Design an enzyme around this catalytic site. Structure first.
Site, short mmCIF file in Angstrom:
data_model
loop_
_atom_site.label_atom_id
_atom_site.label_comp_id
_atom_site.label_asym_id
_atom_site.label_seq_id
_atom_site.Cartn_x
_atom_site.Cartn_y
_atom_site.Cartn_z
N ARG C 60 44.49 30.12 39.75
CA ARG C 60 44.29 30.73 40.89
C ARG C 60 43.24 30.07 41.99
NH1 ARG C 60 39.85 34.80 42.39
NH2 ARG C 60 40.12 35.65 44.15
N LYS C 250 47.32 42.64 46.89
CA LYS C 250 45.73 42.91 46.56
C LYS C 250 45.41 44.31 47.07
CE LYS C 250 42.69 39.59 46.09
NZ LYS C 250 41.77 38.88 47.12
#
EC number: 2.7.1.40
Lengths: 518, 518, 511, 501
Positions: C60, C250
């Site tokens: 990430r 998200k």
């Protein structure tokens, strides 16, 4: 051990079936109602005493045949045999009286000027149906009278006509003014006064006919407990029976007989209108195809179990016992499966009306039901009945389900319920407990009508009303306690569930109690 | 709409998860007990009143530290703060007093003659462990005294030694008669009087030591409600604690702290011998691998839910709230899942004993548990709890389970129970109802010990005994009506379940009643 | 017994919980993917080699901080460390690269004390922007006075400061302070329950997403998704050039939780972005939103990532807390396809221990799943379709449960056939065979999938090329310890080459 | 909406029952076997062709009466009528031949009032019977039932050679009447003298199954296999459970046997007749659990001996048997000596087909999969994955290539909705496959192709041709296809989800 209790502990339905033990005896109580048609072979006071002893709960009268004097003298003889046990109220069983209407029936005339004469219809041959009243009692091999006068209007030019419970089959070839020239598909013995079915036809016969108006008035005057209303096609048919009975017949329970395709199709409006259902399988097996009757049965029974209203399985359940001392293996299985499916009552027609062994058939239906009541997978059934309306603001329903949960936990001898109208004991019946419901009442119409529900043993309390209400409550509780000890439902020191309320009058049942038997 | 009731109607566990709703608010009633370790940060009467207001139910006293003079004053302060609310009995909460034992512990000595001072341990540097008592207040980065004199006898070379909640780990290079020479695997800041753990190697210290003998006698003398018994390996360790408490402290509830591999391995005999379990996760995380603690947690909680005895989830539940005003996401998930798993209580250690934000730590555990209780799949949980012992001849169990079923059906405001010993209120709690259990008692020990069970909101009746028992029953019932109205549990017109019995004294609970709130 | 197989035979969920056994060791296979935020603690090639060895699956990149040239060199070092293991393709683990966008932000303009119970104006006028104080504060979001009513709450600086709106103007609001604190400059503002009319992507976000397509990133973690059109906006930015890059939304606030179903049907996956969610919604309510979002993604068969503070104390300490341990376990037990580490791997002192600790916790939790109820509820909830691949997938998962198989071998080009096996949650590890390298990187998003990259030549017959790719997966699982020779495995292939023709399920012993 | 599929989506057993629809028509596949007893009403080649067209699958021969040369000609006519449809192998229906044995039996001698007293003697010169060990097996209080349980007798006092007994039920007593002993452990031999020669005759006549009468224990089934031998090793033994001892020692009988028959007529004489359904549902469910065949029998459409329509009890019995899970349903006098034989076969075809659609498959498969033991067999794992796949896509069929039957038998165990088309070159397998619910067997008469992959595809395409022509599916529909990794039995491991061409 007893009661198929090892089968009751099974995790899965298949394992419940696998653990069904023939060496496991049931308890003494039989939960399903037995309805019996009373006819020539059982209408004496002597025989009717032995029918009650064998386990008859409801006396049905078929108003398709017989005059008003024949049915009144039968009603009188039922009550003579019922009130002969009334001297000890602990052993008095209440017996309901049921009227079954003729309804919109199409029926044949008399063969050769006789009721018992039989012509022999051989296969492929012609037969002239007529409406001519000269040929009314002169029915031959070649001619046939019937009573539906609009029969030439509502049939097609290739329709099928079924006579004598579907056994004789015809096909319309030529259509006349008053006549109908047929061709016999399935032949056989044609006798007198046999019921005719037209399964394809929109039959425009009355909902409540001329004879039915006279019959229902007679039901009100003789004080019957329930009407078995024949050929109910829609909800407005049920409302018309409700309106015909009116104010005086408002407490008489309407049971809609589903006998045809339109009754099956429009079932939900009929059920919401009616007080209960009869799966009238005889006429249904001619109207719809015979292979589809079990689908109709298990729909009707299951939806009535869901809606919480009475359902009666009917027709040909022990049919060979008209002539024989014991039933076939189909007949034993059928009674068992109908009790298993969830039929609150089971019925006998020609077996108790005109059979050679009518006491044996009542006894056989008692023995099969009681074994099948032990064979119920209660674990699944109670868990599925709980999920239907699992929130309600009605306080009386919460006490009813809480009693049934309690009755499973101690594996109780009974659920004792005090009720005025039936309604508190009717609420316990809907959750299907293993334990027999002992419904205590002073209303005798409540005692007779409580036989319509699975589980319920109604007891008529003939004692005077004690001056204090709380002491009057305990007197009725002790009465039921004496009943179950006399019947062998429970002994001293067994556990029972006692349902009561907080004040007198209907609708206040809120008190559940787990008491030992003194 | 509210209470996660839309999620409660799901037919599958997966759809129950899917219908969980942040806009669906819970009821005011919080069921799970919050146990708090009292230390310097929460010892004053002034602070302890605010702990009760934030929702403390049990006061834990750590007997690893402190003398008998100090703990008696802590006990006195808890009781002075609890009895300030006793003036108004409607708003009075009972607070339990809990004695957490020292047990078979291994501690280090003082760093350079100082409790506060610290040294740094370098990774791959040596550290000579000693048992010589001249080095007792003389520990540093080279020398480490500890108090377990049989350390060399039970440890062979290469086995690991963990210090200060498993943060520092050492590995043994050579062992002498009264020494060990280690190598530091994991480095860090070494301080004074830190706990030492030896996983794998069996420690031969007693279950009840001579210090532990005196502390339990102090528990009987100071009238404590429960004992959290440390490091329980087997059933004879529980029997030894029960013997030291004796006949005088027979009503003190033993809670075994399962804290090592042997207590997990012999769990069923420990649970049989104890009145409850603590999942003491702190030292268990060092003794077994830290990835295996949830397996052990969900085992113990599930088996205690199966056996019907209390279970406490402990250690580091909101560990960041020692320093910070609001927890991490892991800590909020931990408190939720423990209550979801079925832990009857949840615990706060250093959060309430030593932390900067103890009132916020109690509030956050109150907020998370109350949300978690609504998120429980009660439909499956109760159905599986019913099937554990579906036949029992005990009639008080049948009353208890029938009341829980009735509470689900009407979605009740509460289950009001009159109880003397706790047992009838305990029996309701084991089936896990959604409805809060308002236990009415004149016994204060029963009122304090009821915080051990999920659901029980105990209330202490201070009125003298009315001679009419029917009036004395209904005065206590209306007192419980007045608690839930004032607490916002229900209002006037709402439906509650009321559980009483047929005579005074203990063990005769048999009456369930569905009543409106006046 | 091994792998919690005594607990798997339980007839009730309670008895499954009762039979969980600490002396029942799992298989070698760890099904849940591990996502790791890379920063200064884990940026070097030598560190990243040990990250892969400890069990990192997705790298990430937080694009909230750091320049494009910094992030390019991170990507370079990840790929340097990944392709060092390429020399033996039997032991080669593929590593995904994830771009987590900054998102749209509400900001403020030497610090000042905010007294609890006092008052503060919030102007939109740029005369009072460059230095703010205890009475006057400035915000960059112009349309606040539309989206906030009277009595609405306003949080500043990760929910440390809290403000209640007392009166509303056109270009100002006047607040009352509730939970006061110390207010600095340039700090993050949150509006709980507000339908915020900020753009789906900022001006920075369009630059960063375009960069990801150039850098060949496998997935996107798109911040602050409120609705389906926001997901379609991110899809529009990536375009046709990056059409295969997976968009993981998200969910960070009240509105995204409310309008979740439309987001999920628009997105390729979901992140339960718990840190921002814990600021935005009440902190007591975060687990409700966790199990909602995880369960619905498990219902839909799309990936779900649990995120934020999972092993938070491993920034500073070599062991985690008991709260941190149970959280990682309960996330894997809830049904999270992936689990994330933020500051644990970005800036922390113990990043290799934390990656290993997530691997050890997940593997125990995968064994502790009640597979008997879980597969039964997925079987029931599955709609009866006419898709051959779906029928084959559910038949394969079923056949793995019947014979307790060592693996489910799936040949796949896109991922889709292996994804369909994953959604029914098998106990057995899915060994997805592929020649597509992007598929092998993107397969770590799904639970169960152990992606293997076939680097062998394409064989003469199609059937013998099919059997070589099966035999390669037999050789991987023997070498990685998933099965031995003579163990039973399930094999998924198709009837012709190209995607969408997986119809064949074969039960074979391992050679 | 068809096949009761709205009722298939219900979350509870009650709602499944509530949604059962008379207007929902079933598929043309009928899965339950129909076993017809052949007698003088259905013995000609002309009638037997119409029996097959109406839907006969197994021809039962009762060996209680009739000579060997009578039964050989009966066997010959079944095969003459079966092979008249053999020209078109797409529409060829295989027909099995069953041998029901007479069994051991207690009879009376040569030549009765209610509540009387008669004495039972065993001196070969008052009522005599031919079971000499009767004094050991019965006690004081035990019952003795003469002439299909019509006359009931309770023993008062028992001697060494004699029994003195009180009459319970009346009726006239005649010569050579059959005696039952309720509750007894009867030491009559498992195979009698006459049954030995009947069982060797079935091997010579090439029968497919034996309905072995009066099976009490596990060693009894082994005596039936001992008589059949290596020349009759492939002939399946179906035990007739006829008494208390067969019900009590059921699990050992089921272990030894290839199947069970719920022989309800003899059972209801032996046990109380109200308890027969309990015994039926025990035996059906345990055979469903074990995966072995079960046949429901006696008086299922009994009134169709005389009448052209059955009773409502008779219609409900056949439906509830197929509902419970019986692999085959039997007709006795209905087809042997009844006036309406073809109508009864049609009625059993029509009722069973509606009942198969009414099975709550969702619970049944969930429970059958739950109780399935985890073993390492590839065939078992393929079979249960195939049934799972057939439920998910709602497939037209499960096509199974099988040599011996066994792979198609493992699919049939898990009770799918979809018809199991078993393709076989073995003619005995094709006949024997009628014993199992779901299995629609077809005989591939084509020669073995040289390339085995071509020979595999030819038989799969043959099954596509049968199901198109029989109305099980059409072109473009989805079916499940079962094959294996090499030739020979025991290697079925490969499930495939194929479009129908």
């Amino acid at each position: 051990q007893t009661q198929q209790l090892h089968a009751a502990m099974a995790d899965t339905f298949l394992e419940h079936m696998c653990r069904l033990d023939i060496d496991s005896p049931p308890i003494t109580a039989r939960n399903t109602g037995i309805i019996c048609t009373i006819g020539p072979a059982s209408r004496s006071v002597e025989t009717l005493k032995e029918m009650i002893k064998s386990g008859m709960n409801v006396a049905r009268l078929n108003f398709s045949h017989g005059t008003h004097e024949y049915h009144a003298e039968t009603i009188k003889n039922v009550r003579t045999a019922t009130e002969s046990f009334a001297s000890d109220p602990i052993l008095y069983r209440p017996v309901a009286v049921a009227l079954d209407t003729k309804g919109p029936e199409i029926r044949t005339g008399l063969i050769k000027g006789s009721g018992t004469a039989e012509v022999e219809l051989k296969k492929g041959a012609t037969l002239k149906i007529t409406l001519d009243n000269a040929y009314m009692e002169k029915c031959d091999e070649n001619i046939l009278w019937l009573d539906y006068k609009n029969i030439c209007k509502v049939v097609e030019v290739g329709s099928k006509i079924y006579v004598d419970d579907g056994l004789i089959s015809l096909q319309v070839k030529q259509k006349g003014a008053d006549f109908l020239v047929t061709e016999v598909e399935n032949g056989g013995s044609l006798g007198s006064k046999k019921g005719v079915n037209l399964p394809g036809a929109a039959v425009d016969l009355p909902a409540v006919s001329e004879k039915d108006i006279q019959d229902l008035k007679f039901g009100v005057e003789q004080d019957v407990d329930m009407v078995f209303a024949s050929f109910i096609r829609k909800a407005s048919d049920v409302h018309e029976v409700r309106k015909v009975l009116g104010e005086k017949g408002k407490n008489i329970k309407i049971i809609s007989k589903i006998e045809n395709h339109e009754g099956v199709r429009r079932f939900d409006e009929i059920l919401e209108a009616s007080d209960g259902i009869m799966v009238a399988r005889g006429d249904l097996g001619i109207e719809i195809p015979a292979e589809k009757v079990f689908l109709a049965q298990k729909m009707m029974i299951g939806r009535c179990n869901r809606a919480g209203k009475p359902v009666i399985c009917a027709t040909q359940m022990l049919e060979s016992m008209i002539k024989k001392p014991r039933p076939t293996r189909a007949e034993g299985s059928d009674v068992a499966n109908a009790v298993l499916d969830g039929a609150d009552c089971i019925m006998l027609s020609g077996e108790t009306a005109k059979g050679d062994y009518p006491l044996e058939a009542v006894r056989m239906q008692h023995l099969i039901a009681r074994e099948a009541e032990a064979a119920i997978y209660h674990l699944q059934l109670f868990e599925e009945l709980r999920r239907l309306a699992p929130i309600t603001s009605d306080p009386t329903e919460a006490t009813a389900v809480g009693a049934v949960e309690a009755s499973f936990k101690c594996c109780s001898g009974a659920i004792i319920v005090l009720t005025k109208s039936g309604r508190s004991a009717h609420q316990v019946a809907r959750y299907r407990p293993r334990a027999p419901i002992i419904a205590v009442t002073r209303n005798p119409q409540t005692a007779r009508q409580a036989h319509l529900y699975r589980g319920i043993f109604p007891v008529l309390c003939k004692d005077p009303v004690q001056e204090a209400w709380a002491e009057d409550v305990d007197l009725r509780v002790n009465f039921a306690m004496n009943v179950g000890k006399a019947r062998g439902f429970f002994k001293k020191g067994d556990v029972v569930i006692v349902l009561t309320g907080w004040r007198p009058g209907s609708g206040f049942t809120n008190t559940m109690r787990v008491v030992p038997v003194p």
